Amino acid sequence: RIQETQAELPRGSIPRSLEVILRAEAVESAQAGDKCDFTGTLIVVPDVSKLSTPGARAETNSRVSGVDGYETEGIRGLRALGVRDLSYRLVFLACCVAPTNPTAESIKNQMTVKEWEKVFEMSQDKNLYHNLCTSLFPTIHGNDEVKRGVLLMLFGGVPKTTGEGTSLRGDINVCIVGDPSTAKSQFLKHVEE
Amino acid sequence: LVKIPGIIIAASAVRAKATRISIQCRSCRNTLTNIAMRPGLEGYALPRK
Numbered sequence: 001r002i003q004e005t006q007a008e009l010p011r012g013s014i015p016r017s018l019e020v021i022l023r024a025e026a027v028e029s030a031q032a033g034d035k036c037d038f039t040g041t042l043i044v045v046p047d048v049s050k051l052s053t054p055g056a057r058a059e060t061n062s063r064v065s066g067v068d069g070y071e072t073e074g075i076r077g078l079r080a081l082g083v084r085d086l087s088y089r090l091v092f093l094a095c096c097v098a099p100t101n102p103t104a105e106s107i108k109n110q111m112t113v114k115e116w117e118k119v120f121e122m123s124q125d126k127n128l129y130h131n132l133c134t135s136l137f138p139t140i141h142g143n144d145e146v147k148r149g150v151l152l153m154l155f156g157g158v159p160k161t162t163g164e165g166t167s168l169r170g171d172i173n174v175c176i177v178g179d180p181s182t183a184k185s186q187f188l189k190h191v192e193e
Numbered sequence: 194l195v196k197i198p199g200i201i202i203a204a205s206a207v208r209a210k211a212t213r214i215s216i217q218c219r220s221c222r223n224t225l226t227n228i229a230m231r232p233g234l235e236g237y238a239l240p241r242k
């Protein structure tokens with residue numbers, strides 16, 4: 001199942017939902033929560049309980065009439081002429097699925113030479129501690145402690161397990177309490193973006 | 194349609210043949226009426242339902 005994104009919403013409208021079908025190799029990809037582009041076809045599939053009122057329907061061209069004792073009444077007449085209700089729904093078949101915007105060895109191999117050059121340039125800078133604070137939060141004034149804490153939470157720690165069957169946390173949790181208008185929701189919005 | 198001469202040597206008795214028939218149901222006593230029979234030496238098969 002896929003959903004229309006927020007940027008495509010018109011005034012006062014709920015996002016549209018659509019069904020996508022994957023066949024064979026393309027079945028693997030497109031996990032839940034992703035934001036992806038699809039390329040394929042738009043195809044019509046029949047439906048059953050759409051018509052509570054009579055609508056378009058099919059029949060046979062043969063000019064056949066009933067005989068006494070076998071008169072083409074309701075049920076028998078409909079079954080004899082092969083009448084089917086024409087109901088339909090729209091379904092999308094996908095042949096290509098891609099990310100809208102795109103195991104350490106695998107990550108290293110995926111990156112190109114220029115991307116790896118940029119990564120290495122970033123790696124050996126002490127100002128990485130400072131510049132990352134200003135880059136993610138350019139407009140918010142002060143509160144550098146909160147920026148450092150949020151960056152540390154983003155990078156996170158290492159999880160471990162012990163021999164007795166217990167487990168140890170590797171994640172970090174952060175709480176912010178403040179007076180009104182102290183840019184408290186701006187950090188949340190920036191991290192969401 | 195054909196035209197043929199001949200000499201008649203045998204003639205059976207005059208009998209009765211039905212052209213319109215009506216039948217009745219055993220249980221609800223409903224009726225089917227005014228069923229047209231075919232001319233000539235042709236029969237008719239009663240319905241079952």
Ligand SMILES: Nc1ncnc2c1ncn2[C@@H]1O[C@H](COP(=O)(O)OP(=O)(O)O)[C@@H](O)[C@H]1O
Nearest residue numbers: 139140141142178179180181182183184185186
């Ligand atoms: N230190 C700051 N630097 C820049 N803008 C600020 C700062 N403090 C407050 N603001 C502005 O004031 C508003 C604060 O509202 P908000 O952060 O939603 O308050 P709260 O999160 O406490 O409900 C924001 O729109 C923000 O633009």
Ligand SMILES: [Mg+2]
Nearest residue numbers: 183184185186
């Ligand atoms: Mg707020």
Ligand SMILES: [Zn+2]
Nearest residue numbers: 218220221222
């Ligand atoms: Zn009956």
